[PDB]
């Protein structure tokens, strides 16, 4: 619900595509980050992997059955762990009659069916599977090695956070969904849909993020009192009709196989898989993210939640502020419209 | 035998203190009145009888594995998923159960509360303090002691141990028979009622057929999929397909008895504690021999019937071991122990 808040799609050339961080800076020079979500279609020649035939014996350690409870466009999703299985067993179940995609003509019908049947026939989600489907020799947009400043966490701190600085794989089926959330530490996220059916996304522009959580707080007051950042549990589903009803600007975009999805700092997003598919995702950062990292409201109710020490980042990139920030006197106000400094080359 | 309880309706018994004292003998008696044909029966013990003097010392009782009951479904067909939660005390459980979020809704007539249950089943998933190893009976109580009924089920070489159930509003038990098609005894110590649905054993197959029709995937994955205790079917749905069933509400101080191959289901009206165990009579042995068991899980409850066949059907042991004991169960027939009442 705002012209600069609309999701942009980008069609780089192979030459534009090579330097990932630089292309992120470019799309931010173009205002992409204001939608909180952006699509990047890689050049037709580019592939991260020659074939997906060898993955059928790949194991999904902890498939998740997504049980959704709720009504009136407000839902809570519970992730029930299932027996490990291969993507062959997963694909069988996904393509079976009980879990296959419904028959539809236009996306809007599939969306209506998603929100109508959300709480029925809980699908299984092969989510959070460690590993990459990139071949190790692919230097362009390798989710396994984006070479972003986020690397400072593993390089300097020695901390490995699975899914954040490591690649995650997601085997989806119809009605498998991801709840409204920003990334851990309000980082950037990258999502590549390797193969299969599309993943539809909803995005709330970061400028309106506080409004969304506000709405969420009003509708899940128990969850809000238990935890300030309860949306970080990734259990909260809110329908587009509720967003529209409460004046939350949002946009929707559908990601097809072979396409990239970029999530920008503090960009709340949600969505669902049309059917059987496989996506790879990880987090990344830019200089712009550092401030977000400093100000990210995190989950207080679980000890295992992702928390990154911002020390190394402030020290390296905001030396003048380090002591000030360590003193708790860094009162910088984030401007969600501003592009990342690396985009000055394009301005 | 078919002349007794022809209706197959749930019967209620009001034994005097001397009729009540011998539990096994009384099970045989209520079977001599045809109670077993409903698959479910109520026994109101004499007011003088109390298993426990008071229930004010159970706040420290620990529920090791409370389960949040997520329900998915519509049109009277649901699947329940029991999610293990963090251990809590009965005091903690009572505080949640009675809280605004989870407490019983306002209602005047039972049918209203039933309507609300079937309407809101999928929302605000409650916590069931179920399957707690324990008893609220005092040691000295020798009548109807669920902890030690001393039926032939003790011969198994724990189905015969006591289990406590701390319910809150719209906590449910799915349609099922007992493991090994055994008997069930359920005593409501205190608190709000527990409503029960039951299908006469005579018509159990019909329910199964209906169930298999509505969950073909589950049935393909497991013949006895109802034994997972995840399948909720509303009474309106049973009535729509002409499946005979009965309902009965159990109140504090009351015993419910489920009989071999009696399908039953139900829900708790609010915070309560029940205590139940399985038991057997000689009639059960054939049921045990013929019970269709859950194929798909290695840790399902499976009792070897061998000791029972030797001890109570020696003449048939060989035949049974050769897979050739094709006795047909007559669900109307009382347990032989009922002879003295016939």
């Amino acid at each position: 619900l705002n012209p600069s808040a609309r999701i942009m799609t980008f069609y780089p050339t192979m030459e534009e595509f090579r330097n990932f961080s630089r292309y992120i800076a470019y799309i931010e020079s173009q205002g992409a980050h204001r939608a909180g979500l952006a699509k990047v279609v890689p050049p037709k020649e580019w592939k991260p992997r020659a074939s997906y035939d060898d993955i059928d014996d790949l194991v999904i350690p902890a498939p998740i059955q997504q049980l959704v409870t709720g009504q009136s466009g407000l839902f809570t999703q519970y992730n029930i762990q299932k027996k490990a299985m291969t993507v062959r067993e997963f694909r069988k179940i996904a393509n079976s009659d009980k879990y296959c995609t419904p028959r539809y003509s236009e996306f809007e019908e599939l969306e209506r069916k998603y929100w109508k049947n959300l709480t029925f026939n809980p699908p299984i989600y092969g989510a959070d599977v460690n590993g990459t489907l990139y071949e190790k020799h692919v230097d362009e947009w390798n989710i396994g090695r984006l070479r972003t400043i986020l690397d400072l966490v593993e390089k300097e701190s020695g901390i490995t956070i699975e899914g954040v600085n490591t690649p995650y794989l997601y085997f989806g089926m119809w009605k498998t969904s991801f709840a409204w959330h920003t990334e851990d530490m309000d980082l950037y996220s990258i999502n590549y849909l390797h193969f299969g059916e599309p993943k539809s996304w909803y995005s709330v522009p970061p400028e309106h993020g506080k409004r969304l959580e506000r709405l969420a707080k009003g509708f899940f007051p128990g969850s809000a009192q238990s935890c300030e950042a309860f949306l970080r549990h990734k259990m909260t589903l809110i329908s587009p009709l509720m967003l529209k009803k409460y004046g939350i600007p949002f946009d929707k975009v559908t990601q097809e196989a072979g396409e990239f999805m970029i999530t920008f700092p503090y960009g709340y997003h949600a969505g669902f898989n049309h059917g059987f598919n496989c996506a790879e995702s990880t987090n990344f950062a830019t200089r712009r993210w550092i401030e977000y990292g400093k100000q990210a409201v995190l989950c207080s109710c679980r000890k295992d939640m992702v928390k990154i020490s911002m020390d190394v980042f402030v020290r390296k990139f905001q030396p003048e502020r380090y002591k000030l920030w360590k003193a708790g006197k860094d009162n910088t106000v984030i401007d969600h419209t501003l592009p990342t400094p690396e985009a000055a080359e394009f301005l | 035998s078919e002349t007794l309880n022809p209706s197959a309706r749930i019967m209620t018994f009001y034994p005097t203190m001397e009729e009540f004292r011998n539990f096994s003998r009384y099970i045989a008696y209520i079977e001599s009145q045809g109670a077993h044909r409903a698959g479910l029966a109520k026994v109101v013990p004499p007011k003088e009888w109390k298993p426990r003097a008071s229930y004010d010392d159970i706040d420290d009782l620990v529920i090791p594995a409370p389960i949040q009951q997520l329900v998915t479904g519509q049109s009277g067909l649901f699947t329940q998923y029991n999610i293990q939660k963090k251990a809590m005390t009965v005091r903690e459980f009572r505080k949640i159960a009675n809280s605004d979020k989870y407490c019983t809704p306002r209602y005047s007539e039972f049918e209203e509360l039933e309507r609300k249950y079937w309407k809101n089943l999928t929302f605000n998933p409650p916590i069931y303090g179920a399957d707690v190893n324990g008893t609220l009976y005092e040691k000295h109580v020798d009548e109807w002691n669920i902890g030690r009924l001393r039926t032939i089920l003790d011969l198994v070489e724990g189905v015969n141990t006591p289990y406590l159930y701390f319910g809150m509003w719209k906590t449910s038990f799915a349609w099922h028979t007992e493991d090994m098609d055994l008997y069930s005894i359920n005593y409501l110590h205190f608190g709000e009622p527990k409503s029960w649905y039951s299908v006469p054993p005579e018509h159990g197959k019909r329910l199964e057929r209906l169930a298999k029709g509505f969950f073909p995937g589950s049935a393909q994955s497991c013949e006895a999929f109802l034994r997972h205790k995840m399948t909720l079917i509303s009474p309106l749905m049973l009535k729509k397909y002409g499946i005979p069933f009965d309902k009965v509400t159990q109140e504090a101080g009351e015993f419910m008895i489920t009989f071999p191959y009696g399908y039953h289901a139900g829900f708790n009206h609010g915070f309560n504690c029940a205590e139940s165990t399985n038991f057997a009579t000689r009639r059960w042995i054939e049921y045990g021999k013929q019970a269709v068991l859950c194929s798909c899980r290695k840790d399902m409850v499976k009792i070897s019937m061998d000791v029972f066949v030797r001890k109570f059907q020696p003449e048939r042991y060989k035949l049974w071991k050769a897979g050739k004991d094709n006795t047909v169960i007559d669900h109307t027939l009382p347990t032989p122990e009922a002879a003295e009442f016939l």
């Binding site: 762990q81 027996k83 | 594995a65 999610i83 159930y165 799915a174 840790d299």
Partner: peptide, 13 residues
């Protein structure tokens, strides 16, 4: 995963 209990199939996440 899951384990069987008197009251049914209990899912321990």
């Amino acid at each position: 995963x899951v384990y069987n209990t008197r009251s049914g199939w209990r899912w321990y996440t």
